[PDB]
């Protein structure tokens, strides 16, 4: 008796099971209400019920166990968590809790937690003694997260160009700067697919705030990982809540020496949401940005770091420029002094239908020698010195024509000499 197991079951089988259990007509009923009635009827027989979810401690002291399939939205099937148990096990926002639950009695509206069985997918004896995320020693990117497929596919050209322009390692904090209508969607899809193919052990999390739902359901059915999104039909409060829950879960996972990867596509939208939810202080800067509005996105971005004791946190955010709004322009670069990695995309190259439209000149990675060998770094330096004199479109055409001849970049580097 698990909550996620009943959530994954279809509607027809749940209706059939409820009709066999002998309850009210479930055809004219919601799936969540059907599951609730089935759990009630199964607990009336004396059997136990189990559930799971991410903890969201409220300001009063209690909390609930949000579900991932609903993008951490407030649902009727949330499991209550009393503050007594929180105080007894030192629980915090983001801790994954899995234990026995019971249906609400007369006068209650949510399931109660009796005994916790597993904390953060581990024993509670290992979670009671742990080092906080704020005390971990940061470090630079040491492990190399190669994005090249290696299967010789035609779509691998984007990953090869990305590796030649800006290699990505564990704990990297980069930025994907690109004007609208440049190809950010396809680039993010390719990055997510390459991460899921090359490094399936890492925890991939794609955050899409204030996006077109069709794109949400497309990304959810395309990438092999977790997708937490919030369409534009929701207020900025839900955006802030989802961002907080995601970053808290990422911190709790990193605290257990896990490799978390967050592919953010709405850093600008997140900053707009934070500027909308912040109370007015009577002081407005140039472009309509509050003085204390960028602090929360600043911390959300700076949360990414590489841990020496174990694990890492990678955050790749895509910033929006040339959107016609001065607020986004002020945000983007305020954040430019940030992202230890900038991958610029050119609109002029995208208009020529030359995919990918990557600005190789302004791209780059700091401390790239820690992720590449000596000969590889020398070859990349020679390639950059050869590409720099040529124009952007000409350099992109040259790179595409030279990478189409071979499958691996090593052969291209060997033929360049």
Ligand X SMILES: Nc1ncnc2c1ncn2[C@@H]1O[C@H](COP(=O)(O)OP(=O)(O)O)[C@@H](O)[C@H]1O
Residues touching a second copy: how many (CB under 8 A)?
A: 69
Among 315, 320, 343, 349, binds ligand BEF (CB under 6 A): 320
Partner touching 187 among a second copy, ligand X, ligand BEF, none, CB below 5 to 8 Å by kind: ligand X
**123 scored as a contact of ligand BEF (CB under 6 A):** no
**403 scored as a contact of ligand BEF (CB under 6 A):** no
Q: Are 313 and 260 in contact (CB under 8 A)?
A: yes
**105 scored as a contact of a second copy (CB under 8 A):** no
Among 61, 76, 180, 213, binds ligand BEF (CB under 6 A): 180
User: Which of 258, 336, 252 minimizes the C-alpha distance to 301?
Assistant: 336
Chain position whose Cβ is nearest to Mg ion: 184
**184 scored as a contact of ligand BEF (CB under 6 A):** yes
**218 scored as a contact of a second copy (CB under 8 A):** yes
Q: How far is the CB of 223 from ligand BEF (least distance, A)?
A: 16
* 299-328 residues near a second copy, rule: CB under 8 A: 299, 302, 305-306, 320, 323-327
**372 scored as a contact of ligand X (CB under 6 A):** no
Q: Give the 3-state secondary structure of the chain.
A: CEHHHHHHCCHHHHHHHHHHHCCCCCCCCCHHHHHHHHHHHHHHCCCCEEEEEEEEECCCCCEEEECCCCCCCCCCCCEEECHHHHHHHCCCCCCEEEEEEECCCCCCCCEEEEEEEEECCECHHHHCCCCCHHHCCEECCCCEECCCCCCCCCCHHHHHHHHHHCCEECCCEEEEEECCCCCHHHHHHHHHHHHHHHCCCCEEEEEEEEECHHHHHHHHCCCCCEEEEEECCCCHHHHHHHHHHHHHHHHHHHCCCCEEEEEECCHHHHHHHHHHHCCCCCCECCCCCECCCCHHHHHHHHCCCEECCCCEEEEEEEEECCCCCHHHHHHHHHCCCCCCEECCECHHHHHCCCCCCECCCCCEECCHHHCCCHHHHHHHHHHHHHHCCCCHHHHHHHHHHHHCCCCCHHHHHHHHC
Partner touching 178 among Mg ion, ligand X, a second copy, none, CB below 5 to 8 Å by kind: ligand X
Partner touching 44 among Mg ion, a second copy, ligand X, none, CB below 5 to 8 Å by kind: none
Which residues lie below 8 Å from residue 182, measured CB to CB, with a gap of 6+? 345, 346, 347, 350, 357
Q: Which stretch binds Mg ion (CB under 5 A): 66-74, 123-131, 179-187, 253-261?
A: 179-187
Q: How far is the CB of 339 from ligand BEF (least distance, A)?
A: 8
Q: How far is the CB of 146 from ligand BEF (least distance, A)?
A: 26
Among 61, 76, 138, 180, binds ligand X (CB under 6 A): 180
Q: How far is the CB of 188 from ligand X (least distance, A)?
A: 7
Q: Which stretch binds Mg ion (CB under 5 A): 111-119, 164-172, 176-184, 253-261?
A: 176-184
Which residues lie below 8 Å from residue 128, measured CB to CB, with a gap of 6+? 89, 90
Return d(Cα 137, Cα 270) in angstroms, integer.
27
Instruction: Tell me the β-bridge partners of 275.
Output: none
Among 184, 251, 252, 344, binds Mg ion (CB under 5 A): 184
* 236-295 residues near a second copy, rule: CB under 8 A: 275-276, 280-292
Nearer to ligand X, 44 or 181 (CB): 181
Nearer to a second copy, 152 or 282 (CB): 282
Among 4, 9, 93, 185, binds ligand X (CB under 6 A): 185
Among 185, 198, 372, 406, binds Mg ion (CB under 5 A): 185
Nearer to ligand BEF, 290 or 334 (CB): 334
Q: Which stretch binds ligand X (CB under 6 A): 39-47, 177-185, 250-258, 289-297?
A: 177-185
Which residues lie below 8 Å from residue 19, measured CB to CB, with a gap of 6+? 25, 26
Q: How far is the CB of 173 from ligand BEF (least distance, A)?
A: 11
Question: Which residue has 């949360």 as its token pair?
Answer: 303
Residues of this chain that bind Mg ion (CB under 5 A)? 184-185
Which residues would be at the binding site for a second copy (CB under 8 A)? Answer: 28, 129, 134, 137-140, 171, 173, 180-181, 185, 212-218, 231-233, 275-276, 280-292, 298-299, 302, 305-306, 320, 323-327, 329-330, 332-337, 340, 342, 351-353, 361-362, 364, 366, 381, 384-385, 388
């Amino acid at each position: 008796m698990n909550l996620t197991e009943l959530k994954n079951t279809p509607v027809s089988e749940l209706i059939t099971l409820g009709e066999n259990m002998g309850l009210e007509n479930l055809a004219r009923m919601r799936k969540q209400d059907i599951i609730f009635a089935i759990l009630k009827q199964h607990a009336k027989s004396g059997e136990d019920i189990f559930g799971d979810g991410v903890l969201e401690i409220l300001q009063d002291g209690f909390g609930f166990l949000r579900s991932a399939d609903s993008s951490y939205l407030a649902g009727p099937d949330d499991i209550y968590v009393s503050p007594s148990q929180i105080r007894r096990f030192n629980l915090r926002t983001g801790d994954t809790i899995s234990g026995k639950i019971r249906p609400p009695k007369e006068g209650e509206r949510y399931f109660a937690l009796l005994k916790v069985n597993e904390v953060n997918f581990d024993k509670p004896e290992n979670a009671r003694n742990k080092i906080l995320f704020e005390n971990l020693t940061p470090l630079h990117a040491n492990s190399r997260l190669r994005m090249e497929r290696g299967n010789g596919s035609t779509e691998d050209l984007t990953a090869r160009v990305l590796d030649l322009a800006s290699p990505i390692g564990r704990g990297q904090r980069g930025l994907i700067v690109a004007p609208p209508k440049a190809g950010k969607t396809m680039l993010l899809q390719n990055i997510a697919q390459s991460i899921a193919y090359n490094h399936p052990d890492c925890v991939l999390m794609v955050l899409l705030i204030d996006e077109r739902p069709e794109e949400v359901t497309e990304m959810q059915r395309l990438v092999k990982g977790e997708v937490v999104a919030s369409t534009f039909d929701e207020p900025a409060s839900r955006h802030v809540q989802v961002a907080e829950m995601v970053i808290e879960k990422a911190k709790r996972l990193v605290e257990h020496k896990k490799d978390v990867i967050i592919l953010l596509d709405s850093i600008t939208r997140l900053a707009r949401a934070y500027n909308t939810v912040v109370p007015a202080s009577g002081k407005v800067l140039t472009g309509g940005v509050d003085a204390n509005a960028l602090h929360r996105p600043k911390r959300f971005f700076g949360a990414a770091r590489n841990v020496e004791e174990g694990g890492s946190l990678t955050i790749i955010a895509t910033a929006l420029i040339d959107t016609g709004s001065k607020m986004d322009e002020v945000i983007y670069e305020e954040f430019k002094g940030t992202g230890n990695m900038e991958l610029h995309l050119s609109r002029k190259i995208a208009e020529k239908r030359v995919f990918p439209a990557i600005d190789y000149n302004r791209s780059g990675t700091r401390k790239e020698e820690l992720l590449t060998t000596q000969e590889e770094l020398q070859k990349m330096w020679i390639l950059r010195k050869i590409i720099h004199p040529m124009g952007e479109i000409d350099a992109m055409e040259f790179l595409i024509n030279k990478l189409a001849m071979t499958k691996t970049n090593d052969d291209f580097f060997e033929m360049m000499k």
